[PDB]
Amino acid sequence: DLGKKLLEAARAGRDDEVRILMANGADVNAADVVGWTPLHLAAYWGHLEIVEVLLKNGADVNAYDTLGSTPLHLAAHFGHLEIVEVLLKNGADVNAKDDNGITPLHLAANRGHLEIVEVLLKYGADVNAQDKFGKTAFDISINNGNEDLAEIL
Amino acid sequence: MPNFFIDRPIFAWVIAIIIMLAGGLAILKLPVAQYPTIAPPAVTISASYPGADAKTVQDTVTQVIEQNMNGIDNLMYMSSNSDSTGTVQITLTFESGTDADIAQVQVQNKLQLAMPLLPQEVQQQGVSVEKSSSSFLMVVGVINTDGTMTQEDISDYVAANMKDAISRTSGVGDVQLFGSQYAMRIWMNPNELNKFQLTPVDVITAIKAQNAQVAAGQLGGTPPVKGQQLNASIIAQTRLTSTEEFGKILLKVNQDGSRVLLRDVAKIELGGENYDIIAEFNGQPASGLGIKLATGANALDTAAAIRAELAKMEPFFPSGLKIVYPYDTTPFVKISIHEVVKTLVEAIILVFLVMYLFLQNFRATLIPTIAVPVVLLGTFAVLAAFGFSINTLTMFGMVLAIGLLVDDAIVVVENVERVMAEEGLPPKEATRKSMGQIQGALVGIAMVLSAVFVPMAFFGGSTGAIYRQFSITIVSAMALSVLVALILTPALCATMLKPIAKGDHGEGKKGFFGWFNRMFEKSTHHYTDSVGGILRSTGRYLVLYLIIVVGMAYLFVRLPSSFLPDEDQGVFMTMVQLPAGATQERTQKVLNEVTHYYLTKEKNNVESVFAVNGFGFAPRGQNTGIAFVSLKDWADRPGEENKVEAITMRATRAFSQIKDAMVFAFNLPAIVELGTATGFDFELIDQAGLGHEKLTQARNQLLAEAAKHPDMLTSVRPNGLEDTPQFKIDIDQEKAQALGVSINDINTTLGAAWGGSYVNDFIDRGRVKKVYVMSEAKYRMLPDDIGDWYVRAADGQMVPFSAFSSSRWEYGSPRLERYNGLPSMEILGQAAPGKSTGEAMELMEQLASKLPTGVGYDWTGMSYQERLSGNQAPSLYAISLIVVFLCLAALYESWSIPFSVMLVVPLGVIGALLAATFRGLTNDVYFQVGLLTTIGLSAKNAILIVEFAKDLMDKEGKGLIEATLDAVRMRLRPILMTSLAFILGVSGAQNAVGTGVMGGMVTATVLAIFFVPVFFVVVRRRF
Amino acid sequence: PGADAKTVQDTVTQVIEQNMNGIDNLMYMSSNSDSTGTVQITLTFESGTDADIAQVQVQNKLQLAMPLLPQEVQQQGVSVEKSSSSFLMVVGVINTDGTMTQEDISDYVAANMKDAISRTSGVGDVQLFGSQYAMRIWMNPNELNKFQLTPVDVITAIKAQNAQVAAGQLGGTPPVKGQQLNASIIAQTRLT
Amino acid sequence: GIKLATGANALDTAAAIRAELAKMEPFFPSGLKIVYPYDTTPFVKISI
Amino acid sequence: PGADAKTVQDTVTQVIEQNMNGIDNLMYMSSNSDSTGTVQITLTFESG
Amino acid sequence: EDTPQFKIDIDQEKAQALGVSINDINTTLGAAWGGSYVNDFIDRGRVK
Amino acid sequence: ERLSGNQAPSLYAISLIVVFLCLAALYESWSIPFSVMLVVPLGVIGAL
Amino acid sequence: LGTATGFDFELIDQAGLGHEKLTQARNQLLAEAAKHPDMLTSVRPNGL
Ligand SMILES: CO[C@H]1/C=C/O[C@@]2(C)Oc3c(C)c(O)c4c(O)c(c(C=O)c(O)c4c3C2=O)NC(=O)/C(C)=C/C=C\[C@H](C)[C@H](O)[C@@H](C)[C@@H](O)[C@@H](C)[C@H](OC(C)=O)[C@@H]1C
Ligand SMILES: CO[C@H]1/C=C/O[C@@]2(C)Oc3c(C)c(O)c4c(O)c(c(C=O)c(O)c4c3C2=O)NC(=O)/C(C)=C\C=C\[C@H](C)[C@H](O)[C@@H](C)[C@@H](O)[C@@H](C)[C@H](OC(C)=O)[C@@H]1C
Ligand SMILES: CCCCCCCCCCCCCCCCCCCC(=O)O[C@H](COC(=O)CCCCCCCCCCCCCC)COP(=O)(O)OCCN
Ligand SMILES: CCCCCCCCCCCCCCCCCCCC(=O)O[C@H](COC(=O)CCCCCCCCCCCCCC)COP(=O)(O)OCCN
Ligand SMILES: CCCCCCCCCCCCO[C@@H]1O[C@H](CO)[C@@H](O[C@H]2O[C@H](CO)[C@@H](O)[C@H](O)[C@H]2O)[C@H](O)[C@H]1O
Ligand SMILES: CCCCCCCCCCCCO[C@@H]1O[C@H](CO)[C@@H](O[C@H]2O[C@H](CO)[C@@H](O)[C@H](O)[C@H]2O)[C@H](O)[C@H]1O
Ligand SMILES: CCCCCCCCCCCCO[C@@H]1O[C@H](CO)[C@@H](O[C@H]2O[C@H](CO)[C@@H](O)[C@H](O)[C@H]2O)[C@H](O)[C@H]1O
Ligand SMILES: CCCCCC
């Protein structure tokens, strides 16, 4: 009811509406057909305030979609440094693997978010973590030809 | 000229016959349609890409086509859609007056040169270039009642049997099949394919090989060996013609010598090309034909011919098949024509009654009864000459015109009857003098009425196209009325009318007519006594006039504005919108709930519900559906409660209960091709390669600002879809190359299985049709089924898809919009109650300027039309007034006197505004032309009052007040006679037409007879 | 692209010229085949000829020749235009700041300005004084031979890896009964 | 280098080009600027 | 090329002829499907 | 009048068993009896 | 040929009406036209 | 319409002589035109 309204508000970035919905008691575990909670969407679209507001209102930080991807995966992949930090502070699994064995470090390394990679390493990201193809964040950096990223890993 | 034909009544009769024959000939040869070509010429480039997403379609097809749409003449703008149904529709709208054939061939030609740049799959499917128009003559629905046929089974029959016959039918333009004919569906099994070490690539290779037309050659072909006895054509492979033949398509032979056929690894059946659209007519499987009217064709004859041909097909139809007509414009054109002929006859009947009531002789009552038909027939001839058609706009233009034709008839005859009654002249001499008095004014009235109606024909775009229909009709009818009034009706008066003795006002008569003459002679004396008192105290009445002009101006603005109103057309849609990721099974259940509702609760009003799943106005995703609700006759649905407006709100109100569905009913626009509903059509454009996501943010930012102005903007929404979750799959090139699996074989397996691959053509019962390889439903449903598909490596091992793939969820557009070859987002909205669209647009421009850098905007459709046409209005009002003034100046030989006539304008208008205000009507086109005809007839009255008044002062040397009182006296009877004919008498358009006059006349008649003499005296005294 | 005057003439110009027949009000025809790879066949018509129909007729014949032309020539896009030989005007574009180079300016005009001007009614032909950007793969024969690869392999890889794939949908039509999810399948997209 | 279509009006076409360029100028990058180094239409306007 | 009249008629002539609806001033339409492979669909229009 | 047609049937299985592709069969048959337009050549400076 | 013959009657009909009406207007009579138009058969038999 | 005195001549290969032969023919014609300054002035090829 209000869960399908929160999912739209979280995606759009309507801070005021999410706040009003949190007061009315909108379900923060309300997901779409792929299993994306409002935190997933807020993390994907880079809505920092909503991410903070949702976590305050008892949202699952380690919630996973039907392919095992958590909000930190999305935040790390789409270069939302502030959200990545907020999620990790609220106890986000930094070494979380999706169904492909891919981690937030792999995704951040791929798109080349050097700042985010450093934040993930700070909170204890397994640099030697391999995907289903046996490839690390280092193996990505050399393939992409990222000199700065290659040095860090 | 009157003098000429008074002495030559046979000539006058010959001209009348030539006009009647020309008119009678025109009526038969004239086209017939509901509405003419109003919308500007639009050419839509349609294409299909099986299994392609919005972006794949856009970035391979749409952009390539859009880049190659140069060197095309008279193009105003270009809009394109690219959605996840694998569809692209590029609409190119052209300048009004462009040759639609030349426009299309230029678009067609530039596309054909861009075809080698499109994908092979799109080239194979083909790109359609058609004249963009949803103005169907009728929709012929084909249904199966006994449930023996599916939607596929019906569509195939309609295509193979009916479609070509409806195409052949006399007066039929374009025929669209509501569905696809059969296709050879190969439903592959990945468990079977993997078992025999095969892929969809092998299935496609085998179908391409074993289902083909092979050129062999000839026996004894030239150059031959001299002495050859026979020359025969050689036949090798031809196309397959059965599911059996396709079954035996040999894929592989094993070591033991066993045959692996196509039937072993795939299910094979005659299915449909498309499964995205599910159409139902009251819950029963249905197809249909979208018939259009051909250029210069008769809608009534075409519709009859279509039904006549469908009747000859009745015997050949399969068991359970029925023909239905959910949409038909034919009944409207019948009424439009019928209600003109009704008014035409009622007018003639009422004139006769009033003519006899006052003049009291049958010989006089026949002069209008001849004149009016002659002019009306003449109008039909002039419409044919200028290339116009019999339609609503031209027909209701004639209804309004009849008022002017009736006046010209009464005016000429009454003036002869008076001149005879007052002087005692013989009819022939009386007509000479009578015409001598009015002949100058009649010519003047023609130029004034020309100066009123002609200018609105020079409006630009859609608005001008509509006004042109009324303008030419009324000007033609009016122009011929004056010609007939100067040629025929004088000659009739001089020959048919009987001598009246000098001073015989029929007061010496007995009975009703004896009483009436004494009664009316009193009323005429009391009238002149009243006007006598009015002209003593003019200043007071000039204050009462300014109260009316203030009242008019105020009551004009407060009345709601429109072009063509939303009327009960016996049809209305019901949009069914499920959330992102919803399937067609979920959508169908809501469509069933919508269908059930209308057939249960609205059984009295609703005839049928055409429930189309996976459709809007174009093909949409599984999560969308529309229901075309067809109502019963208006005779079966009495009361305002059982009209679309109330039925719509009741339906929308009841469907607020439905969970996980935005279900709402809405009425059809009068002309859909424009979609004009008051408001605007705003385009938000990416001008700096910002991307889709950045354009979405800017749109949300604009929608937010618009929502903070309810006082100015109302219902400001996007005409687009929000980003939906989509299944991203990444093929590892390293793991593919390492295992010896080619990416072509990988992308083909995925594309063919999950998306469907159009392989080649086969021949089903003498008709060429498409062959489609695709995965059987249950193996291409969920992401877990990805790994069930195997691709053969170079070494011969079968590698599963999970081995060299890695999938994740992301968000992407299910429908990407572009405007003028730039990424856009269409935004609809309207002005708030008591606000103009011009104001609302000016705010949208203001709000749009505060959006991020690189985000531009533009106006399209009705906005573009209203933007340009609105700027012309002041220039046309100026010419209209300036020329009206100049015409009267030449008539009265005075710069001052014309004002006395022109001051009548508000007296005609005020009545219609009061009538419209209290009945709660809108300022629609029908009403606006209604005001022009009310003003015209009001001016006509005043023109003859002033002419008579000025003539008495000039010729007979009478005083200002004497001449005025003597003039208004002479002109009282003919003004009341015309006015009485309306009072006796003489369906939303019918209201706008009738009420655009009735209220006007009831007041205008009373106001004019008292105020015209004031204007003349006041103006004459001033100058 | 990369053809000499004769290759161009013998594989395109002649093939097109031979199909130009039964065209109304044609005075004469002149063609130029040059070593840039460019063909230009001008068909001059009688004074009073409808340029719209002249274009329609000329292209009707070209479309018969189109399939006989090389795939490289078709994929470059053949253009039929009914314009003056001289220039109406020249719309110059400079960068006063000097932030953008001659190549950067040409690309912008091509990508952001040219198309809209080419669609404008009255504009018979637009000619970019420059070139729109392309993904230039500048091959090294020393490095190609080293790893035992050819321009053939380079072209095979690009078409295969820089692909835009139509991969279908999850819960697509016709679906199984009880399907709850419907989502577009996104495989390979064009490299950016 | 814009070339006039056969029969098309030079002044009318030139006016439409300037109108379309006027819609582009606002969204130019920093530094980019239009210049008119060759136009045959001004002579027609002035000489008339 | 190398297609009998029937194959030619079903795959070409029928497909073209069925799309020859909505053409102004069409008196009649005659077509030949030959064993050479050739099709010739002639559309004769109203005089004028 | 109806003409005689020499219908030659290619056994798809028998060909696959012997290891001959039907592309080579269809081309050999097609090119031999019917003729095959391969490409153009220049005869005294003209495309033929 | 069929068209030529099928429209010939209505051609003669309107041709007579027009000539009749033209005489009626010119000579301001209904008798002169009728007295004249009766001559037509005397000519037509000659041509036949 | 061209220039006042100017003419536009086209030398044609009628018998399929080739480019080299047509060049010789052109070079010869240009030389003969150069020997008549009294009649012809600036006779040159419009090519490369
Ligand atoms: C004014 O016009 C109306 C009817 C014309 O009558 C018809 C017969 O003619 C149509 C024309 C010429 C269109 O252009 C349409 C259109 O673009 C549609 C839809 C819808 O399906 C339509 O339904 C039409 C449509 C008609 O039925 N939008 C789409 O498909 C898309 C991509 C819609 C996206 C979002 C929503 C769902 C949509 O924006 C909604 C919020 C409203 O704006 C419309 C439903 C309007 O209804 C109203 C006034 O509430 C119609 C345009
Ligand atoms: C009489 O004509 C003149 C103006 C036409 O007015 C214009 C607007 O219309 C033109 C047309 C319809 C052409 O066909 C041209 C042409 O073919 C040219 C050149 C050359 O740029 C042109 O310039 C035009 C040209 C025009 O400017 N030749 C070439 O490009 C090639 C491939 C080679 C050039 C060879 C030499 C160098 C050239 O022949 C030269 C010797 C002169 O003969 C010309 C430059 C003429 O200059 C004058 C004033 O003597 C013009 C043709
Ligand atoms: C497609 C558009 C259609 C265009 C149609 C154009 C047709 C052209 C017609 C040309 C008319 C000729 C010029 C007028 C004639 C005047 C001189 C006639 C000789 C003469 O002595 O004058 C009298 C005329 O009457 C007078 O004193 C004046 C009256 C003149 C009568 C004019 C007759 C024209 C009839 C045309 C019919 C078509 C109508 C379509 C609008 C003769 O006659 P009379 O007095 O001796 O009489 C018989 C009494 N016993
Ligand atoms: C292709 C197929 C199409 C088929 C469609 C139908 C075609 C319609 C064709 C129209 C034919 C015209 C018919 C004319 C009617 C003539 C009436 C006879 C009059 C008559 O003989 O009396 C005259 C006196 O008339 C008088 O008393 C004076 C005249 C006043 C009365 C005139 C009334 C005419 C009414 C016409 C209505 C026709 C409607 C048709 C739609 C005598 O002669 P005279 O004494 O004058 O001559 C000598 C002067 N010294
Ligand atoms: C001063 C000069 C008047 C002298 C003549 C006056 C009377 C004429 C007598 C004629 C004999 C019949 O008398 C006539 O009957 C008709 C009936 O149609 C009536 O005429 C009228 O009378 C009634 C009222 O009584 C009206 O409502 C009605 O409109 C009408 O019927 C009159 O009563 C009379 O005008
Ligand atoms: C609400 C809708 C708009 C209302 C429009 C009203 C206009 C139509 C009604 C006009 C009726 C005319 O009524 C007429 O009025 C004038 C005064 O104004 C009267 O005249 C009166 O004033 C004059 C001037 O001082 C005196 O000389 C005269 O003796 C006296 O009777 C007439 O005797 C009367 O017949
Ligand atoms: C470009 C459009 C310009 C026209 C616009 C003006 C339209 C108004 C037309 C005015 C109506 C005619 O005006 C009226 O005509 C009649 C004849 O019919 C004139 O009367 C005239 O009759 C005849 C015929 O012309 C003359 O020989 C005679 O000298 C004169 O008395 C009147 O003196 C005049 O007042
Ligand atoms: C005065 C003669 C008028 C004739 C018009 C037909």
* Sequential DSSP letters for A30-94: ---TT---HHHHHHHHT-HHHHHHHHHTT--TT---TTS--HHHHHHHTT-HHHHHHHHHTT--T
> B211: number of CA atoms within 13 Å, CB side?
31
- Across chain A, which distance is largest between two alpha carbons, in Å? 50
Q: What number of other Cβ atoms are within 10 A of residue B243's Cβ?
A: 17
Pocket test for ligand 4, best of B7, B11, B13 (most atoms within 8 A of CB): B13
- Spacing, Cα B951 to ligand 7 middle (Å): 14
* Residue for token pair 């054909």: B112
F10/B237 CB distance under 8 A: yes
Nearest ligand, measured from the Cα of B947: 7
Instruction: For residue H42, report the phi and psi dihedrals to the nearest 5 degrees.
Output: 55, 55
Tokens of B1016: 């003349």
G22 chain-B contacts, CB cut-off 8 A = 14
Asked if C76 and C15 sit in the same domain, the reply is: yes
Cα distance between residue B838 and residue B844, in whole Å: 10
B783/A67 CB distance under 8 A: yes
Cα distance between residue B213 and residue C141, in whole Å: 45
Q: Are strands B215-218 and B805-812 parallel, antiparallel or unpaired?
A: unpaired
Residues in chain G: 48
- Residue of A33, A65, A144 to mutate, interface with C, max C Cβ within 10 Å: A33
User: Which chains are within 8 Å of C by 3+ CB pairs?
Assistant: A, B, D, F
D31 chain-C contacts, CB cut-off 8 A = 95-100
CA distances to B451, B642, B668, B677, B861 from B567, rounded to whole Å, are 32, 13, 8, 12, 21
Vertex F35 angle, CA F34 and F39, to 5°: 150
Tokens of B657: 């209960």
Collapsing DSSP to helix, strand or coil, B87 comes out as strand
- Spacing, Cα B525 to ligand 5 middle (Å): 20
Tokens of B34: 């509901």
* Residue for token pair 């091959």: C139
CB B413 within 8 A of CB B514: no
Cβ contacts of B129 within 8 Å, gap of 6 or more: B43, B44, B45, B46, B104, B107, B108, B111
Q: Where are the alpha helices (DSSP H) in B952-987?
A: 960-970, 972-984
Collapsing DSSP to helix, strand or coil, B113 comes out as coil
Distance from CA of B218 to the nearest CA of F (A): 6
Comparing alpha-carbon positions, the chain B residue that sits nearest to F21 is B209
CA nearest to C109, candidates C121, C118, C96? C118
Nearest ligand, measured from the Cα of B44: 1
CA nearest to B238, candidates A62, F7, A137, G14? F7
Helix (H) or strand (E) holding B547: helix B538-558
Tokens of B765: 């019962």
CB B474 within 8 A of CB B397: yes
CB pairs under 8 A between B and D: 14
Closest atom, ligand 6, to C-alpha of B548 = 3
CA distances to B416, B865, B992 from B834, rounded to whole Å, are 51, 22, 21
Report the residue from F3, F30, F34 with minimal CB separation from E35: F3
Instruction: For residue C107, report the phi and psi dihedrals to the nearest 5 degrees.
Output: -60, -45
Strand partners, C170: C183
* Residue for token pair 């692996």: B260
Comparing alpha-carbon positions, the chain F residue that sits nearest to E6 is F2
Collapsing DSSP to helix, strand or coil, A128 comes out as coil
* Residue for token pair 């794949």: B56
Cα distance between residue B842 and residue C186, in whole Å: 41
E7 chain-B contacts, CB cut-off 8 A = 213, 238-239, 763
Collapsing DSSP to helix, strand or coil, B365 comes out as helix
Vertex B937 angle, CA B936 and B938, to 5°: 90
B725/C183 CB distance under 8 A: yes
Report the residue from F8, F12, F13 with minimal CB separation from B234: F8
B294 chain-E contacts, CB cut-off 8 A = 22, 24
* Residue for token pair 């203030």: B550
Cα distance between residue B953 and residue B964, in whole Å: 9
CA distances to B213, B749, C165 from B744, rounded to whole Å, are 26, 8, 10
CB B933 within 8 A of CB B404: yes
Collapsing DSSP to helix, strand or coil, F43 comes out as coil
CB B786 within 8 A of CB B805: yes
Helix (H) or strand (E) holding B273: none
B638 CB under 6 A from ligand 6? Answer: no
CB B413 within 8 A of CB B368: yes
Q: What number of other Cβ atoms are within 10 A of residue G46's Cβ?
A: 7
Distance from CA of C35 to the nearest CA of B (A): 23
Does residue B550 sit at the E interface (CB-CB below 8 Å)? Answer: no
Contacts 24+ apart (CB under 8 A), C31-36: C33/C5, C33/C6, C33/C8, C33/C9, C34/C5, C34/C8, C34/H48, C35/C3, C35/C4, C35/C5, C35/C8
Helix (H) or strand (E) holding F38: none
Cα distance between residue B641 and residue B647, in whole Å: 7
Instruction: For residue C139, report the phi and psi dihedrals to the nearest 5 degrees.
Output: -70, 145
Are D and C close enough to touch, i.e. 3+ CB pairs under 8 angstroms? yes
| CB-count burial class (<10 Å; 0-12, 13-18, 19+) for B550 | exposed
B809/A132 CB distance under 8 A: no
CB B663 within 8 A of CB B590: yes
Omega before C174 cis (within 30°)? Answer: yes
- Spacing, Cα G7 to ligand 3 middle (Å): 30
CB E34 within 8 A of CB E28: no
CB B135 within 8 A of CB B255: no
B806/A133 CB distance under 8 A: yes
Residues in chain F: 48
Helix, strand, coil percent content, chain H, rounded in steps of 5 = 35, 0, 65
Cα distance between residue A93 and residue A72, in whole Å: 8
The torsion region of residue B974 among left (phi > 0), alpha (psi -120 to 50) and beta comes to: alpha
G27 CB under 6 A from ligand 4? Answer: no
B4 CB under 6 A from ligand 8? Answer: yes
Cα distance between residue E37 and residue B937, in whole Å: 71
Tokens of C120: 């404008």
Cβ contacts of B548 within 8 Å, gap of 6 or more: B906, B907, B910, B1007
| CB-count burial class (<10 Å; 0-12, 13-18, 19+) for C155 | exposed
Does residue B700 sit at the A interface (CB-CB below 8 Å)? Answer: yes
C184 chain-A contacts, CB cut-off 8 A = none
Report the residue from A4, A69, A133 with minimal CB separation from B809: A69
Does residue F35 sit at the B interface (CB-CB below 8 Å)? Answer: yes
| CB-count burial class (<10 Å; 0-12, 13-18, 19+) for H31 | exposed
Cα distance between residue A6 and residue F42, in whole Å: 73
| CB-count burial class (<10 Å; 0-12, 13-18, 19+) for B880 | middle
Cα distance between residue B596 and residue B603, in whole Å: 10
- Counts of helices then strands in chain E (DSSP H, E): 2, 2
Report the residue from B209, B236, B259 with minimal CB separation from F13: B259
B533 CB under 6 A from ligand 6? Answer: yes
Amino acid at position B796, single letter: G
Asked if C1 and C57 sit in the same domain, the reply is: yes
CA nearest to B113, candidates C58, C78, C42? C78
CB E37 within 8 A of CB B268: no
CB B608 within 8 A of CB B324: yes
CB B452 within 8 A of CB B936: yes
* Sequential DSSP letters for B293-340: EPTT-BHHHHHHHHHHHHHHHGGGSPTTEEEEEEEESHHHHHHHHHHH
- Counts of helices then strands in chain B (DSSP H, E): 34, 30
CB C159 within 8 A of CB C148: no
Amino acid at position C65, single letter: A
Comparing alpha-carbon positions, the chain E residue that sits nearest to B131 is E22
Report the residue from D5, D24, D27 with minimal CB separation from B73: D5
B736 chain-A contacts, CB cut-off 8 A = none
Cα distance between residue B913 and residue B1007, in whole Å: 15
Asked if C76 and C145 sit in the same domain, the reply is: no
Tokens of B831: 């002005």
F34 chain-B contacts, CB cut-off 8 A = 215-218, 221, 234
CA nearest to F35, candidates B239, B234, C67, E38? B234
Q: What number of other Cβ atoms are within 10 A of residue B212's Cβ?
A: 17
CB B215 within 8 A of CB E8: no
Q: What number of other Cβ atoms are within 10 A of residue G12's Cβ?
A: 11
Helix axes B330-359, B392-423, angle to 10 degrees: 10
Cβ contacts of C133 within 8 Å, gap of 6 or more: C103, C107, C110, C111
Distance from CA of D24 to the nearest CA of B (A): 8
Distance from CA of D26 to the nearest CA of C (A): 12
Q: From the centroid of its chain, how far is CA A87?
A: 8
CA distances to B22, B577, B720, E9 from B580, rounded to whole Å, are 62, 9, 13, 46
Cα distance between residue A85 and residue A113, in whole Å: 13
Cβ contacts of B114 within 8 Å, gap of 6 or more: B64, B65, B67, B68, C77
Q: What number of other Cβ atoms are within 10 A of residue B917's Cβ?
A: 14
HEC letters along chain C: CCCCHHHHHHHHHHHHHCCCCCCCCEEEEEEEECCCCCEEEEEEECCCCCHHHHHHHHHHHHHHHHHHCCHHHHCCCCCCCCECCCCCEEEEEEECCCCCCHHHHHHHHHHHHHHHHHHCCCEEEECCCCCCCCCCCCCCHHHHHHCCCCHHHHHHHHHHHCCCCEEEEECCCCCCCCCCCCEEEECCCCCC
Instruction: For residue B1010, report the phi and psi dihedrals to the nearest 5 degrees.
Output: -100, -30
Q: Resolution, in Å, please?
A: 2.8
Q: From the centroid of its chain, how far is CA F24?
A: 8
Collapsing DSSP to helix, strand or coil, A113 comes out as coil
Q: From the centroid of its chain, how far is CA B4?
A: 48
Strand partners, B775: B188
G10 CB under 6 A from ligand 4? Answer: yes
Tokens of D14: 């030139």
Instruction: For residue B193, report the phi and psi dihedrals to the nearest 5 degrees.
Output: -60, -45
**What residues flank ligand 5, with Cβ below 6 Å?**
B 510-512, 514-515
Cα-trace Rg, chain G:
13
Residues in chain C: 192
Q: Are strands B724-731 and C183-186 parallel, antiparallel or unpaired?
A: parallel
Helix axes B862-892, B837-849, angle to 10 degrees: 140
Strand partners, B128: B46
Tokens of E25: 């001033």
Distance from CA of F6 to the nearest CA of C (A): 31
CA nearest to B809, candidates B880, B723, B717? B723
Helix (H) or strand (E) holding B178: none
Residues in chain H: 48
- Spacing, Cα B417 to ligand 5 middle (Å): 24
Cα distance between residue B101 and residue B362, in whole Å: 56
Cα distance between residue B980 and residue B986, in whole Å: 10
Comparing alpha-carbon positions, the chain H residue that sits nearest to F47 is H16
User: Which domain does C171 fall in, by range?
Assistant: 131-192
| CB-count burial class (<10 Å; 0-12, 13-18, 19+) for F45 | middle
C105 chain-D contacts, CB cut-off 8 A = 32
Amino acid at position B178, single letter: F
Cα distance between residue B1005 and residue B942, in whole Å: 11
B539 CB under 6 A from ligand 6? Answer: no
Does residue E34 sit at the F interface (CB-CB below 8 Å)? Answer: no
B14/G25 CB distance under 8 A: yes
Cβ contacts of B118 within 8 Å, gap of 6 or more: B47, B60, B61, B64, B65, B127
Cα distance between residue B560 and residue B913, in whole Å: 11
Helix (H) or strand (E) holding B40: none
Cα-trace Rg, chain E:
12
Cα distance between residue B733 and residue C161, in whole Å: 8
Cβ contacts of G16 within 8 Å, gap of 6 or more: G37, G40
- Spacing, Cα B364 to ligand 3 middle (Å): 29
Report the residue from E2, E4, E35 with minimal CB separation from F30: E2
- Across chain E, which distance is largest between two alpha carbons, in Å? 40
Cβ contacts of B719 within 8 Å, gap of 6 or more: B826, B827, B828
Cα distance between residue B532 and residue B963, in whole Å: 12
Q: Using CA atoms of A13, A14, A17, A21 in order, give the dihedral in degrees to the nearest 10.
A: 0
C183 chain-B contacts, CB cut-off 8 A = 581, 724-727
